[PDB]
């Protein structure tokens, strides 16, 4: 989207790339529905790969 | 939400109970995020249960 400037970086490849690293196969992920699902979503598809 | 009138019904519960029905454990679910959320929510609260 154009015209929005957001000064906050995204997450999603740093949790990835944490988790990655730390080795874990299977966890539980606690998620808030007011702040969005988007990075569950990441974690999801990420968690089929 | 209020003042709006919704023809379509909730599809959630058929599905569920279809599912319970041909004894369903392990599966995939594939979606997208243009009808919403809500249903993904569902499938994965009653997974999680």
Do not use: C, N
């Amino acid at each position: 989207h154009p015209f929005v400037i957001q000064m906050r970086p995204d997450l999603k490849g740093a949790l990835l790339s944490l988790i990655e690293y730390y080795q874990w196969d299977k966890f539980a992920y606690l998620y808030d529905s007011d702040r969005g699902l988007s990075t569950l979503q990441a974690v999801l598809d990420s968690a089929a790969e």
